Amino acid sequence: EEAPWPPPEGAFVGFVLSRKEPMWADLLALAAARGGRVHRAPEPYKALRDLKEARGLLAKDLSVLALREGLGLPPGDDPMLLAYLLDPSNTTPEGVARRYGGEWTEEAGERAALSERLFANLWGRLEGEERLLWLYREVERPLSAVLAHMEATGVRLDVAYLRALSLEVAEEIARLEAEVFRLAGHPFNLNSRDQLERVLFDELGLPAIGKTEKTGKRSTSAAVLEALREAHPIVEKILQYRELTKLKSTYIDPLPDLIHPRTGRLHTRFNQTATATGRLSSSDPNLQNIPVRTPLGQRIRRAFIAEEGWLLVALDYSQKELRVLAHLSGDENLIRVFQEGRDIHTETASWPLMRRAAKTINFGVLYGMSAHRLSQELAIPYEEAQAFIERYFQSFPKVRAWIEKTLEEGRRRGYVETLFGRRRYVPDLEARVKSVREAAERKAFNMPVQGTAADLMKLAMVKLFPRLEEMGARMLLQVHDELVLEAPKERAEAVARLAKEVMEGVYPLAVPLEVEVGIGEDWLSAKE
DNA sequence: GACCACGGCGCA
DNA sequence: TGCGCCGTGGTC
Ligand SMILES: Nc1ncnc2c1ncn2[C@H]1CC[C@@H](COP(=O)(O)OP(=O)(O)OP(=O)(O)O)O1
Ligand SMILES: [Mg+2]
Known part of the structure; x- marks a missing residue:
């Protein structure tokens, strides 16, 4: 069964990464499987050149890593997309393999053979599902390519800006913490919801609205606190401290340390097989939840900037x-x-x-x-x-x-x-x-x-992407009902007109789809 | 070092 | 409704 590398054209690929994130991973092993054969490559990186398309479980990831290495290797069939279309609860190779007659291993070879068999079974189950087959070919499969190019492109972060912002915010946080401690009459870990709970409801005369779900403690959530606003001056300070340490600990501090060395940009992962409704998710880091609704939040948005000589184009379906x-x-x-x-x-x-x-x-x-x-x-x-x-x-x-x-x-x-x-x-x-x-x-x-x-937005990205390459532009992020593009400064206004019309006419309904579009040097200003 | 549960919260 | 990540408290 063990044939010599390279493998027959159009074979199923397996591969082992040193870590989940393709942009940060070393390619430990690479193998392929076709015609009841298994071709393990002698040197993974070397062997990557011998491929015309990644085809197998987690194709997008391998393709993102190839793209990072200069190789234009597109993702193709993926048994994961099929399983996901059958039942969106199929979010994992562990789960999917088990469910359809395989075993998710730590060997590239067994993963490649797992890719071949799994695709056989899954594709048969989709014979008879024409609407699910339409989604897989016309939306999902092409989409995975678009996503590989967004993940490899990344978005530029204004590092020094965030560094300075951390220092300012840390000072304010110290002020809120000292105020809170004076009202509490003693210091405690204000990050600890348990210790907070004792202070508010026991030591102070504060009533307890509700309880937490799993362990039934008195809740100190934002909802509960906004109710206790007038009940004590400490509450207000806690709401502010919560917001500041949330944004600092989750965005301001972590983001600067994720710029990739080669690219100098921030690279998220767009998970295509994660949600129960057909939406994408984003992780490592999540860029679909960057702050915006608050003034401190908006100061964080500004950190996301266009490349030198470019602008961001932010498109945004209304309602x-x-x-x-x-x-x-x-x-x-x-x-x-x-x-x-x-x-x-x-x-x-x-x-x-x-x-x-x-x-x-x-x-x-x-x-x-x-x-x-x-x-x-x-x-x-x-x-x-x-x-x-x-x-x-x-x-x-x-x-x-x-x-x-x-x-x-x-x-x-x-x-x-x-x-x-x-x-x-x-x-x-x-x-x-x-x-x-x-x-x-x-x-x-x-x-x-x-x-x-989500289906409409996915279909819109699949239609918009090829038009952008032609025009020298790139797609950077998707946030459920919004797209962030990056265009040469000169063709920004042409790209904005274009992307807008592509999105509004993705798939005419019994009602118009209005899109707002803005252009700017940063994510904040690109949304008017 | 890794991982887990929980409460809590960022976005759509 | 749908996600992913934070610190705390905690296990291994
Ligand atoms: N506070 C919230 N709670 C629940 N879902 C929310 C939400 N905010 C947004 N969403 C979800 C639901 C839809 C989407 C909301 O986006 P926009 O906030 O921009 O509201 P839009 O409908 O476009 O009207 P516009 O505000 O522009 O006047 O995200
Ligand atoms: Mg809107």
């Missing part, structure tokens, strides 16, 4: 998931708001900012928000919130109808579907415990929405 819902439900009054190009969190507010009472709820229909989350996060009475939630479902009848429609059907089939037929199996829809059944219901009806928006 993406809402528009998807209008199309999925077929609700008249809702479509005739987007078609009239009318403000959504204002024209929905007309059925003062009795208008964020339109936004925070528009968001809270997708998630299945309860009258509570609404009132207690809207700073108004409880039944003032309930009235709002019923006034909304009066204006938009077919929404309620689509939600119930989707749940009934998901009970019978055991799964739900995006506009394109991406599935998520939801088993507890017939659980006999109300809280479990109803939790199942909320992820069941949210999935078609969220996952359809």
Whole structure:
């Protein structure tokens, strides 16, 4: 079985990395498998040149590493993408192998043979699933290539800016900590939620709103604290200390230490097989959760900058998931708001900012928000919130109808579907415990929405990418409903016009897709 | 050194 | 609703 390297063309590849992150990994071993043969390469890096496409489990990763090494080696078939389309709970090679007749090993050879067999079985199970087959060829498989090029490109970080910002923020943090300690009458580890809990609820006269989920301690979460705002001057200082040490410990300090030596840029991983709805995730580091909603957060966004001679182009679908819902439900009054190009969190507010009472709820229909989350996060009475939630479902009848429609059907089939037929199996829809059944219901009806928006965005990236190469531009990040591009300073405005139209027309619905676009020297300014 | 559970929170 | 990462407390 053991044939000499190189392997027959179009064989399944296995490979061992020294660590998960392709951009930081040493390629320990490389092998291939085809026609019941196993070809282990004598020297991994050398053998990498002999490939025309990575084909096998985790193809994108190997391709990202090749790309890092100058080799233009594109990802192709991946048994992982197939498994993920069958059941999005297939997020792992350990899980997938086990499930479809293999064993995820630490040997490149056994991994290559695992890639061959696994693909055989998985691809057979997709014979009969034409909509899932359409997604795999037209969206997923091509997408993996686009993602390999985003991961290899990276985004430029303003290191010295973050260094200086760390020093400023550390001083403020010290001031908040000293204030908190004076109000507490004694020092303690303010990072420790346990010690904090004793201080607030025991030593002080503070009431305890709620409990934590797994161990039932008195919660010191932000929600609980915002309620205790007026109850004591220490609370306010703790809210500020929380925000500052969150942003410092998670972004300001770690990010500068991840610049790659060769490239001088920051490289995330876009996980294509991670979420239950069809969305991408990002890790090592996560760049889909860089701060923005706060002033300190926005100072962190500025750190992300264009290469010298380039600009960033930030494109951003407006009310993406809402528009998807209008199309999925077929609700008249809702479509005739987007078609009239009318403000959504204002024209929905007309059925003062009795208008964020339109936004925070528009968001809270997708998630299945309860009258509570609404009132207690809207700073108004409880039944003032309930009235709002019923006034909304009066204006938009077919929404309620689509939600119930989707749940009934998901009970019978055991799964739900995006506009394109991406599935998520939801088993507890017939659980006999109300809280479990109803939790199942909320992820069941949210999935078609969220996952359809993700399908549209994925398809938009697959269509946009080739147009960018032609124009000398590059795609840097995706944040669920936003894209960040990088273009030569001279063609920025042409690229912005173009990317915008590609995204708006990705797949026409019963409602228009409006995209906002900004250009700037940094991520903050590129969003107008 | 690695890893785990938890509470907590950054973003969409 | 969907993620990934932080420090703390803790095990191995
Ligand atoms: N506070 C929140 N809670 C839950 N989901 C949220 C959220 N904020 C955003 N999302 C999710 C849901 C959709 C998306 C929200 O993006 P935009 O904040 O930009 O809201 P948009 O609909 O575009 O209206 P615009 O604000 O521009 O007036 O991320
Ligand atoms: Mg927006």
